[PDB]
Amino acid sequence: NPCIEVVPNITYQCMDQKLSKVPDDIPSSTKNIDLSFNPLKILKSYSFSNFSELQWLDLSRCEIETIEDKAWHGLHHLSNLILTGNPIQSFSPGSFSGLTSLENLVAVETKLASLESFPIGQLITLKKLNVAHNFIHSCKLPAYFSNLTNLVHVDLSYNYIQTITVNDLQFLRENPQVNLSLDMSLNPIDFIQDQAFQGIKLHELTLRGNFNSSNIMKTCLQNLAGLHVHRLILGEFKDERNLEIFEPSIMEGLCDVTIDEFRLTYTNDFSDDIVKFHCLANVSAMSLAGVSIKYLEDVPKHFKWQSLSIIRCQLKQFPTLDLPFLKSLTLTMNKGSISFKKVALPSLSYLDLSRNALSFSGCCSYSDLGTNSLRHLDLSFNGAIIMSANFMGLEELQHLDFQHSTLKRVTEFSAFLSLEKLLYLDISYTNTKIDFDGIFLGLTSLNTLKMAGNSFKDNTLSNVFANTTNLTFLDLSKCQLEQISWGVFDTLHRLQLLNMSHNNLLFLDSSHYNQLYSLSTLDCSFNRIETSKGILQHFPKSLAFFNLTNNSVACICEHQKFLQWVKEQKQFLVNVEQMTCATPVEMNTSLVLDF
Amino acid sequence: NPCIEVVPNITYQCMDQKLSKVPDDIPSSTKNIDLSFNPLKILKSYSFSNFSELQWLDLSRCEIETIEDKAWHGLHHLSNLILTGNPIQSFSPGSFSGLTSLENLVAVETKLASLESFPIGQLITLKKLNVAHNFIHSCKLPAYFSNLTNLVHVDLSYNYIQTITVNDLQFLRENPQVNLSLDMSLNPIDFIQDQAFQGIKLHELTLRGNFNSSNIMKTCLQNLAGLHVHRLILGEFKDERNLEIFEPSIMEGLCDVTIDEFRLTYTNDFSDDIVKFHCLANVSAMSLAGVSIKYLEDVPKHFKWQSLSIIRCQLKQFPTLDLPFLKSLTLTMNKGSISFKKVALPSLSYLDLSRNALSFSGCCSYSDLGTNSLRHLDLSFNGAIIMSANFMGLEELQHLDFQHSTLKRVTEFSAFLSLEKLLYLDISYTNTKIDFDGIFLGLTSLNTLKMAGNSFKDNTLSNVFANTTNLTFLDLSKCQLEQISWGVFDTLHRLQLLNMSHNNLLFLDSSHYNQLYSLSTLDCSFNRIETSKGILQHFPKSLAFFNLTNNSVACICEHQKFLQWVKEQKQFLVNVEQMTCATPVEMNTSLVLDF
Amino acid sequence: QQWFCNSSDAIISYSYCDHLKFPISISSEPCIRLRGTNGFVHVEFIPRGNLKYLYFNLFISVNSIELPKRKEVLCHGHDDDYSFCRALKGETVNTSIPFSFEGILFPKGHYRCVAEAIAGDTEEKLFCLNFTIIHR
Amino acid sequence: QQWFCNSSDAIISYSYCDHLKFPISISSEPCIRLRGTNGFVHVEFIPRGNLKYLYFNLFISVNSIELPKRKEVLCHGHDDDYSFCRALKGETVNTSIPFSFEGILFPKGHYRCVAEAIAGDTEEKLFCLNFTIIHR
Ligand SMILES: *[C@@H]1O[C@H](CO)[C@@H](O)[C@H](O)[C@H]1NC(C)=O
Ligand SMILES: *[C@@H]1O[C@H](CO)[C@@H](O)[C@H](O)[C@H]1NC(C)=O
Ligand SMILES: *[C@@H]1O[C@H](CO)[C@@H](O)[C@H](O)[C@H]1NC(C)=O
Ligand SMILES: *[C@@H]1O[C@H](CO)[C@@H](O)[C@H](O)[C@H]1NC(C)=O
Ligand SMILES: *[C@@H]1O[C@H](CO)[C@@H](O)[C@H](O)[C@H]1NC(C)=O
Ligand SMILES: *[C@@H]1O[C@H](CO)[C@@H](O)[C@H](O)[C@H]1NC(C)=O
Ligand SMILES: *[C@@H]1O[C@H](CO)[C@@H](O)[C@H](O)[C@H]1NC(C)=O
Ligand SMILES: *[C@@H]1O[C@H](CO)[C@@H](O)[C@H](O)[C@H]1NC(C)=O
Ligand SMILES: *[C@@H]1O[C@H](CO)[C@@H](O)[C@H](O)[C@H]1NC(C)=O
Ligand SMILES: *[C@@H]1O[C@H](CO)[C@@H](O)[C@H](O)[C@H]1NC(C)=O
Ligand SMILES: *[C@@H]1O[C@H](CO)[C@@H](O)[C@H](O)[C@H]1NC(C)=O
Ligand SMILES: *[C@@H]1O[C@H](CO)[C@@H](O)[C@H](O)[C@H]1NC(C)=O
């Protein structure tokens, strides 16, 4: 009742009203209610019996100290339950009884003491299970995990875990076919009982911020063996006390684990020597993000790397590389200004060098990379890219992208002259005074073109799009065009959109638009049209949308044929009830037109 | 008569008319006539007696085979005479008799055979003397050079000179106080007689394209000794056959000559080892231009260099340098793209790094150069210059210059905050949306400011020039200003020019311009003013110029006070007879104004 | 009017906003100086938001002259740097952060800046504060 | 119609202009090809100008479509590179120049370009020529 409804019987959002009881005035058949910071010192029975389709309930910081025997009596569809902050000294048997289809649980900050006295029992479906910030001391996995045929994540972070024993993970030895990711971050581990991990497989391990001294880490990392994993997360956080010296021999005892993707994170002490340590010879997907590298010099050839990724790492030089097996290199959001240098990578099929102030002088030919079979290129938000040769060795490509980058010398010759297989292109907001015809020459297949900010010669569209048949999405917006030459759009048989707005154009014609067979949407707005001039019948039939808002229409006893054709087909236009007319009589939404 | 006069009795330019005689119809008291390619098989006597002030005569490719006894009879002021191309088998005594004040001679391509039978004799004044492309075989300097008390250049290039002997230059041994530059370029020298040069001093030597083999050059360069020079020019030309291997030991025997400015030029074979060869330890002004260098690594500290200059040389890196005596470094028009790197030069007072695509990231503080006492800085026509710190160690400067260079992050803080001694500034054509006031803050002395292409916030001038008293030349042109706020130009006591044109401004006011005491010129053109609005009397008295062309003036029976004030003071305006007015009656230069 | 530290060349203070009142506890050590300093900053509060996509808006005024507005992303939300940027509603948050800068030339005037913390997708102001700096 | 060389993938020819007739003798060795070539080019003529500030103007037409115009400085006029750029009026000039380039992708069409030599300060056309290229 006193809370703030947003949508009819939906999102009642009854948060932070000084309450002491579930409200009864709430209309039944609601969808998502929300309570929070409301004092409910005790919770009682049957209170939710009325609601029958509530499928998102929240309870957070609602001071709770006990639950009655049956408080979730009738709830058929509740695919959420948050319980954060609620201090429950200890749970009671038979709880959670009524629920039937639950796909989440969040018991965080609950004053929980162990995992064995947790009366989950039989909850046939439970996708996740989140735990953290609790008073747990053990790590044993109880047996009732046998029934929950679907549980694809567990978290035990920020706990008081001290050791690991061979007794734990036993259920894993018994069950070889259980998918379960894991995390034990921020755990003051100082001992691992020998031969703990044996014939075991996971899907994600994670250890960040645990260790304090070097020898301890040496011993622990040594104690592992026989393990089988899919993603390591090693590193530390910049807001605790951590290591003082990183030695490439600290990660000894690692030449025994099977790994498929190593992943490092921010470290205080670092050295170029850490990488290409001989226990990293079979890591099949390298990765590193946030690491304060500075240089990347020669690397042995007897490595098996299928991927590399550098993200947000300082790099004051374009490093040289030679690896006859690497592919899918990625370097983005760099914190410095660099300049391209030739490399050699005989088998690469992905590249992304974006949002770096990268200047590429002798541009885009074979010799800069020495490869074939490239598929995705992206140099966007970079700086000046002097064009020196049209793409000559890279005769196979699929995407291409400049977004905010001054592209120089585009018009002195016909670039893009050899990309016979392309399916996308983007030259937008790159200051480009198009004064040479035949610029978009030679590229047949192109199903997208975005030329938002681009000037023209003496402000006129001039026979640019020729020999560009397959081209469905076109875009010429935001650019000053004071007229249109005769003969554009001659052959665009398949063009299903044409954005043209925010440019000064006193009148428009109907001699154009005459050959577009299948044009669905046609925006022409913010461009102060006075009236048509064509036959007003020669449009294409397969036409469904228009847009004529913010136009200055001559409203003084003239061209009444148009003035009535507008007043007949108000179905295809939009906001037909909102047009005004610009007369010697101003400040009046006069749409009478008595003629 | 039949030739094409240009200026009244001046520059008759009678070239390439099929003539056979000096024309007589030419009006006397002419200044500069010109004959060329006219067939004059013989030249005769007294022909120039009439002309009495002709002071620039040319004769080139006029086929001549002989001269009469006295053909220059009367010529009082002829400070030129060209004679190129005229084949004279041999000169005759007593020629050149009539002339009295000649300051040039060009006998080039003349079939001359020697320098001893040249009847110059007594020509009291002769500034230059050019010779080339002749049949000369010797090198002896005859004695009659004693009388010509002024001759500051000789040239003997492209000749058939073979050796040098101790007998030549004897006149130099006799005369220790004769200024004479020299040149013997393109001379197939293959022997120098021993002890040729002894107790001799010149002002320029020049040898380019002579040598053919290495040992010959070794021996010749060795034979020099005791010499005293002021400028060496060594190198070769890219259109002959020349050396194959350059050894730093070829320039042996050079540790004996005294030198004050070494100057090298283009060479086919080059090595970084050529420089800092131990026989270049006392060259007091290094220089090199056109040399295909690539790197410049460490250089010994026991060098005495006062200057360095690299021009048009490829350089794929900013070289490091450390020389406690070098000053006035210059690097311009580089053929590549580089990036600044810190250096150390404890005493430098000039720098010029212009027309190179140079990116200067951590910009312009002390640590980048490590010096004081800088005087002239110039980074113009370069690329993006991210500003990172206002100039902090360079508290003494005189000029500063950006011309076409995207200057980033200028507005996030008040740059130029510590240049308390400046006298010039140039921020033009650098896209800069001035939206922060107090940008030109902290710099008191500034007697020039050029802000040609610069946008504004919502197109209005807004209280920018404050605490900028001493400022005589100002400039706000070519930038779109749709109005002017009230209060600009409050304190510009000394401002003697104000360019404001090529911007859209419907009317102007007289409330401004009210405090400029000494404003001489005031352009306001191409900005479609309709009329003033002020009292039309409140202008400054010390005002001498205006400019009102290309303005749309309301010409329909209104604001006639202005329409008559324009028609009264037609002295201060310009082209007052050229104004029209924009009325319902168009296409008429109606300046009647009957009121 | 809660907290304020006195340094050699700085006077700093903050106070709650006028259209939002959610409590926070923040301070730093030691009282910073307007040149190179090294130290820490303590933080303790209760989220009221997911804090996964957290950033700021700063509106700055240098001696009565406005500047443009500043927006600095603090927790990208994917493999972040800090520990406190993984929290949940109603879960106590308590941490300490190290910092160190150098210093530039600063004019001598009355500064001001208003700082507001914004969530990522449920766009709402988690808190607002008035920061008042005097450089002297 | 004076000189023309036949190469494997090029047909080149030139002829005098229509409003200027001053003789020049020029040719190159060997008949260039539209990819990487190395060779020489011979020049002999009589200046009629100081040739100290010499440059070109090139008006180019790629298969009936115009381009912008090209201007390339050839002799700056101060410590230059070549030898022939120190000459005087009526003084015979004779030289040979080496060159070498690589090649780009060129469309297959009828090119054209008009080339005019301009002096520096006494601006006047020293000569004019019609260059006709066929790429095939
Ligand atoms: C195992 O569980 C993870 C949990 O996210 C899931 O991503 C992965 O696809 C699962 N593996 C298989 C084979 O389904
Ligand atoms: C780290 O080790 C040091 C030295 O033994 C000890 O003083 C400190 O308490 C340890 N800290 C942690 C987080 O274990
Ligand atoms: C057309 O482009 C404008 C440019 O801002 C955009 O706002 C509008 O949504 C577009 N209309 C379409 C794509 O129908
Ligand atoms: C019509 O133009 C308006 C103006 O912005 C735009 O908001 C709207 O999306 C357009 N409608 C269509 C159907 O394109
Ligand atoms: C010597 O002659 C040269 C010739 O140009 C001149 O530049 C130089 O100033 C003269 N030297 C003196 C001391 O006059
Ligand atoms: C250079 O020396 C070679 C070999 O002795 C000789 O054949 C040639 O004529 C010489 N050329 C010149 C220009 O002296
Ligand atoms: C004012 O500036 C314009 C800009 O092109 C220039 O043409 C004009 O000569 C200038 N007038 C002066 C400096 O008096
Ligand atoms: C007046 O403006 C014209 C227009 O270009 C300019 O040519 C001329 O130099 C100006 N005259 C003065 C006195 O500034
Ligand atoms: C926050 O952490 C600090 C770390 O020393 C601890 O001293 C403090 O007790 C914690 N917060 C509270 C409310 O105590
Ligand atoms: C606090 O900030 C508001 C802006 O949100 C401002 O109007 C107010 O003046 C500030 N408080 C004081 C005491 O100035
Ligand atoms: C031009 O120089 C060449 C170099 O071999 C020479 O053969 C030729 O004779 C010179 N010109 C003439 C007109 O001979
Ligand atoms: C020679 O050039 C002119 C342009 O200067 C051109 O009009 C003419 O057609 C050209 N000659 C031929 C044969 O095309």
CA distances from A491 to A322, A420, A512, A519, B110 (A): 48, 20, 11, 13, 71
Give me the residue label for tokens 């209104």: B558
Cβ atoms of residues B214 and B242 within 8 Å: no
The token pair at A454 is 């681009």
Cβ atoms of residues B263 and B231 within 8 Å: yes
Segments of B285-443 assigned E as strands: 288-289, 310-311, 331-332, 337-339, 353-354, 357-359, 385-386, 407-408
Task: Give the SS3 label for residue B170.
Answer: helix
Q: Rounded distance, CA A216 to CA A579, Å?
A: 77
Give me the residue label for tokens 């014609």: A509
Q: Which of B108, B237, B311 sits opposite D88 (nearest CB)?
A: B108
Instruction: State the DSSP code for A116.
Output: T
CA of B322 to the centre of ligand 10 (A): 55
Instruction: State the DSSP code for A173.
Output: H
Q: Rounded distance, CA B306 to CA B325, Å?
A: 6
Residue A218: partners with Cβ closer than 8 Å, 6 or more residues away: A250, A252, A253
Q: Rounded distance, CA B243 to CA B235, Å?
A: 10
The closest alpha carbon to A423, from A404, A397, A451, A395, belongs to: A397
Q: Rounded distance, CA D47 to CA B373, Å?
A: 49
The verdict on a CB contact (< 8 Å) between B392 and C105 is yes
Answer whether B154 contacts ligand 5 (Cβ < 6 A): no
Burial of residue B85, with CB atoms counted within 10 A of its CB: 0-12 exposed, 13-18 middle, 19 or more buried: buried
Q: Rounded distance, CA B250 to CA A282, Å?
A: 56
On whether the B1-160 domain is CATH 3.40.50.300, my answer is no
Which residue out of A179, A206, A230 has the highest number of ligand 1 atoms within 8 Å of its CB and is therefore the one to mutate? A179
Q: Residue A359's beta-bridge partner residues?
A: A339
- At A221, give phi and psi (nearest 5°): -55, -30
Cβ atoms of residues B256 and B224 within 8 Å: yes
Q: Rounded distance, CA B390 to CA B439, Å?
A: 12
CA distances from B437 to B412, B429, B440, B455, C60 (A): 11, 19, 8, 14, 14
DSSP string, C53-67: S-EEEEEEEETTEEE
Q: Rounded distance, CA D121 to CA B248, Å?
A: 42
The closest alpha carbon to B307, from B260, B272, B273, belongs to: B260
Cβ atoms of residues A38 and A62 within 8 Å: yes
Q: Residue B446's beta-bridge partner residues?
A: none
Give me the residue label for tokens 């404001």: B500
Burial of residue B370, with CB atoms counted within 10 A of its CB: 0-12 exposed, 13-18 middle, 19 or more buried: middle
The closest alpha carbon to B274, from B250, B243, B300, B253, belongs to: B250
Give me the residue label for tokens 């001696």: C63
Q: Are strands B385-386 and A357-359 parallel, antiparallel or unpaired?
A: unpaired
Task: Give the SS3 label for residue C38.
Answer: strand
- Kindly report each contact of residues B149-152 with a partner whose C-beta sits within 8 Å and lies 24 or more positions away, as own/partner: B149/B124, B150/B125, B150/B126, B151/B126, B151/B127, B151/B180, B152/B127, B152/B128, B152/B179, B152/B180, B152/B181
The token pair at D90 is 């009526």
Task: Give the SS3 label for residue B562.
Answer: helix
Q: Rounded distance, CA B398 to CA B377, Å?
A: 8
> What is the CB neighbour count within 10 angstroms for residue B394?
18
In this complex, is the C-beta atom of B462 within 8 Å of any C-beta atom belonging to chain C?
A: no
Q: Rounded distance, CA A117 to CA A142, Å?
A: 10
Which residues line the pocket of ligand 12, CB cutoff 6 A?
D 17-18, 114, 130
The token pair at A127 is 């996708």
In this complex, is the C-beta atom of C68 within 8 Å of any C-beta atom belonging to chain B?
A: yes
The closest alpha carbon to D67, from A434, B20, B386, belongs to: A434
> What is the CB neighbour count within 10 angstroms for residue B92?
12
Residue D119: partners with Cβ closer than 8 Å, 6 or more residues away: D49, D50, D51, D53, D54, D126
Cβ atoms of residues B396 and B423 within 8 Å: no
Please provide the distance, in angstroms rounded to a whole number, between the alpha carbons at the two ends of chain D. Answer: 20
CA distances from A434 to A361, A416, A453, A454 (A): 22, 15, 11, 7
Task: Give the SS3 label for residue C117.
Answer: strand
Give me the residue label for tokens 């690539």: B294
Q: Rounded distance, CA A544 to CA A539, Å?
A: 11
The number of angstroms, rounded, from the C-alpha of A196 to the middle of its chain's C-alpha atoms is 39
Range of the domain at C44: 4-134
Burial of residue A386, with CB atoms counted within 10 A of its CB: 0-12 exposed, 13-18 middle, 19 or more buried: middle
Give me the residue label for tokens 């037609």: B570
The verdict on a CB contact (< 8 Å) between C105 and B436 is no
- At B174, give phi and psi (nearest 5°): -70, -40
The closest alpha carbon to D113, from D10, D12, D18, belongs to: D12
Edge-to-edge strands, sheet with B331-332: B288-289, B310-311, B331-332, B353-354
Q: Rounded distance, CA A567 to CA A571, Å?
A: 10
DSSP string, A221-287: HHH--S-B-S---EE--TTS---S---TTTT-S-TTSB-S---B---SS--TTSTT-GGGSS-SS--
Answer whether C118 contacts ligand 10 (Cβ < 6 A): no
The closest alpha carbon to B444, from B469, B479, B476, belongs to: B469
Q: What is the CA radius of gyration of chain A?
A: 33
The number of angstroms, rounded, from the C-alpha of A81 to the middle of its chain's C-alpha atoms is 26
Q: Rounded distance, CA A522 to CA A499, Å?
A: 6
CA of B210 to the centre of ligand 6 (A): 11
The verdict on a CB contact (< 8 Å) between B359 and A359 is yes
The closest alpha carbon to B547, from B515, B519, B576, B509, belongs to: B576
Residues from chain D contacting residue B234 (CB–CB below 8 Å): none
Task: Give the SS3 label for residue A445.
Answer: coil
The verdict on a CB contact (< 8 Å) between B412 and C68 is yes
Q: Rounded distance, CA A10 to CA A8, Å?
A: 5
CA trace torsion B176, B180, B184, B189 (10° rounding) = 0
Please name the amino acid found at residue B56.
W
Residues from chain D contacting residue A441 (CB–CB below 8 Å): 107
Q: Rounded distance, CA A200 to CA B573, Å?
A: 97
CA of C129 to the centre of ligand 10 (A): 9
The closest alpha carbon to B432, from B416, B463, B450, B456, belongs to: B456
Nearest CA, atom 4, ligand 11: D95
Q: Rounded distance, CA D77 to CA C122, Å?
A: 68
Please name the amino acid found at residue A482.
E
Q: Rounded distance, CA D17 to CA D2, Å?
A: 12
Q: Rounded distance, CA C118 to CA C130, Å?
A: 15
| Total domains in the fold of chain D | 1
Other chains touching A, judged by 3 or more CB pairs under 8 Å: B, C, D
Answer whether A242 contacts ligand 2 (Cβ < 6 A): no
Peptide linkage before A324 cis (omega within 30 of 0): no
Burial of residue A273, with CB atoms counted within 10 A of its CB: 0-12 exposed, 13-18 middle, 19 or more buried: exposed
The token pair at C134 is 């005097």
CA distances from D120 to B517, D16, D69, D75, D77 (A): 44, 22, 18, 10, 9
Count of all residues that appear for chain B in the document: 595
The verdict on a CB contact (< 8 Å) between D81 and B60 is no
Q: Testing the interface with B: which of A315, A318, A334, A337 to mutate, by most B Cβ within 10 A?
A: A337
Q: Rounded distance, CA A402 to CA A412, Å?
A: 19
Task: Give the SS3 label for residue A577.
Answer: helix
In this complex, is the C-beta atom of D108 within 8 Å of any C-beta atom belonging to chain A?
A: no
The closest alpha carbon to B278, from B298, B302, B257, belongs to: B302
Half-sphere exposure of A275 (CA within 13 A, CB side): 21
The closest alpha carbon to A331, from B250, A317, B167, belongs to: A317
Q: Which of B84, B239, B311 sits opposite D97 (nearest CB)?
A: B239
> What is the CB neighbour count within 10 angstroms for residue A477?
17
Cβ atoms of residues A395 and A374 within 8 Å: no
Q: Rounded distance, CA B43 to CA B63, Å?
A: 10
Residue B208: partners with Cβ closer than 8 Å, 6 or more residues away: B185, B186, B233, B234, B235, B236, B237, B265
Q: Rounded distance, CA B92 to CA B64, Å?
A: 14
In this complex, is the C-beta atom of D107 within 8 Å of any C-beta atom belonging to chain A?
A: yes
Residue A509: partners with Cβ closer than 8 Å, 6 or more residues away: A484, A532, A533, A534
The closest alpha carbon to B16, from B40, B32, B48, B38, belongs to: B38
Give me the residue label for tokens 């044009």: A519
Point out the ligand 8 atom lying closest to the alpha carbon of residue B546: 13
Q: Rounded distance, CA A215 to CA A229, Å?
A: 24
The token pair at C126 is 């988690």
Task: Give the SS3 label for residue A33.
Answer: coil
Q: Which residues of D26-54 are buried (b: 16+ CB within 10 A; e: fewer)?
A: eebeebbebeebeeeeebebebbbbbbbb
Cβ atoms of residues B484 and B460 within 8 Å: yes
Q: Which residues of B331-353 are buried (b: 16+ CB within 10 A; e: fewer)?
A: bbebeebbbbeebebeebeebbb
Instruction: Using alpha carbons only, give the angle B170, B174, B179 rounded to the nearest 5 degrees.
Output: 95
Instruction: Using alpha carbons only, give the angle B337, B338, B339 rounded to the nearest 5 degrees.
Output: 140
Q: Rounded distance, CA A342 to CA A367, Å?
A: 7
Q: Rounded distance, CA D103 to CA D111, Å?
A: 16
Other chains touching D, judged by 3 or more CB pairs under 8 Å: A, B
Quick one: three-class SS letters along A525-567? ECCCCCCCCCCCCCCCCCCCCCCCCCCCCECCCCCHHHHHHCC
Answer whether A212 contacts ligand 2 (Cβ < 6 A): yes
CA distances from A380 to A221, A327, A368, B503 (A): 42, 21, 18, 35
The closest alpha carbon to D54, from D36, D29, D71, D33, belongs to: D71
In this complex, is the C-beta atom of D60 within 8 Å of any C-beta atom belonging to chain A?
A: no
Q: Rounded distance, CA B407 to CA B380, Å?
A: 11
State which approach was used to obtain the coordinates. cryo-EM
In this complex, is the C-beta atom of B395 within 8 Å of any C-beta atom belonging to chain C?
A: no
Q: Rounded distance, CA A108 to CA B585, Å?
A: 85
Residue C66: partners with Cβ closer than 8 Å, 6 or more residues away: C60
B63 min Cα distance to partner chain D (Å): 11
Q: Are strands C93-101 and C37-45 parallel, antiparallel or unpaired?
A: antiparallel
Task: Give the SS3 label for residue A10.
Answer: strand
Cβ atoms of residues A477 and A499 within 8 Å: yes
The verdict on a CB contact (< 8 Å) between C92 and A106 is no
Please provide the distance, in angstroms rounded to a whole number, between the alpha carbons at the two ends of chain A. Answer: 56
The token pair at D106 is 């060129």
The token pair at B400 is 């500063």
DSSP string, A331-393: EES-SSEEE------SS-----EESSEEE-SS-S-GGGT------B----S---EE--S---S
Q: Are strands A288-289 and B357-359 parallel, antiparallel or unpaired?
A: unpaired
Q: Rounded distance, CA B389 to CA B402, Å?
A: 17
DSSP string, chain D: ---EEE-SS-EEEEEE-SS-----EEEEES---SS-EEEEEEEEE--SS--SS-EEEEEEEETTEEEEEE--B---SSS-S-STTS--TT--EEEEEEEEE------SSBEEEEEEEE-SSS--EEEEEEEEEE--
Burial of residue B571, with CB atoms counted within 10 A of its CB: 0-12 exposed, 13-18 middle, 19 or more buried: exposed
CA of B361 to the centre of ligand 9 (A): 43
The verdict on a CB contact (< 8 Å) between B60 and D82 is no
